[PDB]
């Protein structure tokens, strides 16, 4: 509802491999506390096309910048894979 | 605990002196004896109390 559970879309080789061939699959990063239903609701209120299904990924924090004078940890990411129906392809940028 | 319910007087810790004045810690316990009384419509309720309160209870006409 508040639509703070859609932080940033991410574009990688896996993402672009999916974003072709009839059904498109768009991968965003979402609030780690959000649920699948909240992700679908956010997509409903801000895009307008009902996802066919939603898959979720949790990327665990790991050590980064190892050996550097001050080492630091990573940030917890939850990934969401929206899949729109046949024949529909909306743009992530431009509204 | 081993204590009266009417008052709050409890055990008294002291020394066990013997010949040669050898020191060993000992405990004096209060005389918790069951007693039944009539309070609030004479409602009898068994209460573990010290013999001193029992004597106090006997003279104060409560115990009848």
């Amino acid at each position: 509802d508040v639509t703070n559970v859609l932080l940033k879309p991410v574009l990688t080789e896996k993402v672009y491999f999916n974003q072709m061939g009839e059904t498109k699959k768009y991968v965003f990063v979402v609030n780690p506390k959000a649920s699948k239903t909240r992700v679908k609701l956010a997509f409903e209120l801000v895009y307008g096309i009902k996802p066919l299904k939603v898959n979720t990924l949790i990327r665990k924090p790991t050590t980064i910048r190892g050996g550097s004078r001050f080492p630091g940890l990573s940030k917890l990411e939850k990934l969401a894979v929206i899949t729109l129906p046949k024949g529909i392809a909306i743009s992530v940028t431009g509204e | 605990a081993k204590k009266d319910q009417l008052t709050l007087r409890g055990p008294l810790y002291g020394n066990n002196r013997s010949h040669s004045k050898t020191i060993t810690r000992r405990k004096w316990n209060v005389n918790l004896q069951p007693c039944k009384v009539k309070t609030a419509d004479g409602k009898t309720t068994r209460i573990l109390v010290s013999t001193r309160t029992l004597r106090t209870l006997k003279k104060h006409n409560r115990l009848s």
Partner: protein, 110 residues
């Protein structure tokens, strides 16, 4: 300075402002994530103005989500292509469903 103009504004117009700025903030963050935000300071300005609007809206004992939930306007435009895809998907699903049930039924009869 800016807060005075906002103070003159009513509450209903203010919640319209907050939802509009929320949408623009989402768009700015998305454009930044695509490397298409020439002006990267509008994100901060949007957030400060958003924070200010919250302060004026929280001065009065009024919320920002509930007030817009009471009255609102629905959506549009993003319906035509959406219903086409859904109609196409359900027709194919029902066609597959019908074919499967027929195959099973005629197989059991034989």
């Amino acid at each position: 300075t800016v807060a005075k103009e906002l103070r003159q504004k009513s509450s209903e117009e203010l919640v319209k402002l907050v939802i509009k700025l929320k949408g623009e903030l989402l768009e700015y963050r998305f454009k930044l994530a695509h490397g298409e935000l020439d002006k990267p300071h509008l994100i901060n300005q949007t957030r400060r103005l958003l924070a200010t609007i919250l302060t004026i809206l929280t001065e009065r004992k009024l919320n920002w989500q509930e007030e817009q939930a009471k009255y609102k306007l629905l959506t549009k435009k993003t319906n035509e292509a959406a219903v086409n895809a859904w109609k196409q998907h359900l027709e194919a699903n029902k066609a597959k469903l019908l074919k499967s049930r027929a195959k099973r039924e005629d197989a059991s009869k034989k």
